[PDB]
Design an enzyme around this catalytic site. Sequence first.
Site, PDB file in Angstrom:
ATOM      1  N   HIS A  43       0.810  -1.210   0.000  1.00 49.72           N
ATOM      2  CA  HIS A  43       0.000   0.000   0.000  1.00 49.72           C
ATOM      3  C   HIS A  43       0.846   1.265   0.000  1.00 49.72           C
ATOM      4  CE1 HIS A  43       0.095  -0.494   4.540  1.00 49.72           C
ATOM      5  NE2 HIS A  43       0.198   0.823   4.478  1.00 49.72           N
ATOM      6  N   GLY A 148       2.629   5.344  10.389  1.00 49.26           N
ATOM      7  CA  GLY A 148       3.997   5.257   9.909  1.00 49.26           C
ATOM      8  C   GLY A 148       4.728   3.985  10.243  1.00 49.26           C
ATOM      9  N   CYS A 150       3.970   0.886   9.365  1.00 52.69           N
ATOM     10  CA  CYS A 150       3.867  -0.237   8.451  1.00 52.69           C
ATOM     11  C   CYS A 150       5.220  -0.576   7.848  1.00 52.69           C
ATOM     12  CB  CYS A 150       2.857   0.051   7.341  1.00 52.69           C
ATOM     13  SG  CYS A 150       1.183  -0.038   8.007  1.00 52.69           S
TER      14      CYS A 150
END
Lengths: 305, 305
Positions: A43, A148, A150
């Site tokens: 993503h 933040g 991920c």
Amino acid sequence: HHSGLVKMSHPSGDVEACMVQVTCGSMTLNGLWLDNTVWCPRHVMCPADQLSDPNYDALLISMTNHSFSVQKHIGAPANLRVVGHAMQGTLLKLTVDVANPSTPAYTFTTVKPGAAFSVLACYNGRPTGTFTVVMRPNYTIKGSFLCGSCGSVGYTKEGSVINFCYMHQMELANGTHTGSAFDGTMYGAFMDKQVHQVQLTDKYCSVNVVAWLYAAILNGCAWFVKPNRTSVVSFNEWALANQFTEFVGTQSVDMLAVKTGVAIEQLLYAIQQLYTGFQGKQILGSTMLEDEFTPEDVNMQIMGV
Amino acid sequence: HHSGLVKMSHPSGDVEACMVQVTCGSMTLNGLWLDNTVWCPRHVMCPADQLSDPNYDALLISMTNHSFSVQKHIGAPANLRVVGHAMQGTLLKLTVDVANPSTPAYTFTTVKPGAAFSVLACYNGRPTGTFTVVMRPNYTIKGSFLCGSCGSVGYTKEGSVINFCYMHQMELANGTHTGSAFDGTMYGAFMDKQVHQVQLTDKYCSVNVVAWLYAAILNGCAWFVKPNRTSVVSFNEWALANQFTEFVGTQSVDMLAVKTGVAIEQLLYAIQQLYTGFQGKQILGSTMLEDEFTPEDVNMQIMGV
Ligand SMILES: *[C@H](O)[C@H](C[C@@H]1CCNC1=O)NC(=O)[C@H](CC(C)C)NC(=O)OC[C@@H]1CCC(=O)N1CC1CCC(F)(F)CC1
Ligand SMILES: *[C@H](O)[C@H](C[C@@H]1CCNC1=O)NC(=O)[C@H](CC(C)C)NC(=O)OC[C@@H]1CCC(=O)N1CC1CCC(F)(F)CC1
């Protein structure tokens, strides 16, 4: 009396040296740099506007190698040129022109419910904290992850070999977390989209409850032990009706049974009784069953095995 | 609903690169290598026979530089020649002929009761695990340490600067642990001898209980909040009678009060009522007050500050 049990993580240095920042347009997150490959959540390709119904196949086709910016910040700074890109399930696999000179010996594995692993929480490619979690029966973890995070990674270690098992993707409505294995599959039935998702019911991890009751005995706390026994078969029928996982014994559990002289089946009976209530008593400072410690934790931390 | 709180340690890589093995005859333990200095517990000089009444001044005089063997194992292996030796309180300060090329920016500080720090548990100079603890009001920690762990280090980090605050020495009769600050003083009234020692009573850390109740509110859990208030002065009189530390507010606590709109004094009243019993209710999954999370933990992990 303190049990000698803590939430123990692996030392994180080997993994810290693999963390990078990945940017793709308006999106930035963390990646893992091993050999000439950088893994990160797919993503990163999505504009925040479209996170609820992304077409990742079309996003991938729309990218070039120059669409991605990879940066290492800590210790040995570097900007890494991307020279290939590919999608595997919910992860991107970026190829970079420099092999990580600090790549540890590693494998990729999938973690199972009840098993513990260490997490290195990172923001903007900078490690900020480490903690340990157990994979829950509903394929979530009770982590600590903010915007933040991920691309933060989870792993176990066997000898010098790091077994990477988790790459962080999302927070669920109840505050728990989930992510991907490095084959690109999401744990559980979850999808990497910003949409409401059925979350499955959690359960008590019976094998870990047994481990914790053995830790109690190893600390001189055994008021709950009786001659009474419940067979594994009978316990597992009971567990299905009472939100417990079915019990599967292991050599690590057997070692605790031998050390303490208390049979597994005695503790399966104890669990059934304690589930109905501790009657005002405590076990290792707790008035409820604990399932966040594994048989391996108890063997290592208390028995030094 | 998961609180988003975990026991979070600093990433340990910077400190891993400072750990060494120190041997003196039949004794081996861990040391910390910074610049041209190796710190370790002074009982490395003691034969196991004499640990109960050692004369450390005479042991020190009996040693030469060649009495000590310092080895680094991980990452950048090395045998370090000792070229000076000195005792500071309960620590040895060995001077070695090579400066650690991976010395981080660092300071030495003493940790106070209620404050948290990260521990790197090591055996034979090899890091094996990391965990976080709070210094208890009786100057012990609830760690996980086995034979060979002495010289394991505790630290906090401010920016890139590592603040070393603990070097592990011993396990007390109740299973808790204590050690030295790097000025060589033992925490509390403890001595580094193998003798029975008075252990002081522990207390609940009031400021951390307040932090945890704020974490509950930040997670939508506020059934325990009432208009009723207890002043800091009145609470602190009550605390002395009820095995609580006296409350001292800080800017970190004030930030939680502002974010939630709940006054400290409302939570001091809540604590007094909850101490008498939770009346069958839970707060963040617990039926008892929690004091192992600091105001800073709650600000960082839940509020992203
Ligand atoms: C990546 O850095 C980030 C990590 C998250 C942010 C907050 N904590 C984390 O662990 N991941 C995401 O934001 C992720 C992105 C998608 C494309 C996979 N989305 C995400 O985690 O969103 C979760 C949202 C926000 C908080 C929350 O409760 N939920 C789930 C909830 C949203 C509303 C609903 F109605 F759809 C029901 C589910
Ligand atoms: C150093 O590696 C080691 C670390 C210990 C070993 C077990 N867990 C640890 O944290 N330190 C020592 O062994 C230390 C050495 C002295 C010289 C400072 N001694 C120590 O920790 O001994 C503690 C003993 C053993 C376990 C226990 O309950 N106690 C305390 C208890 C002994 C009997 C008594 F009667 F004296 C009462 C106190």
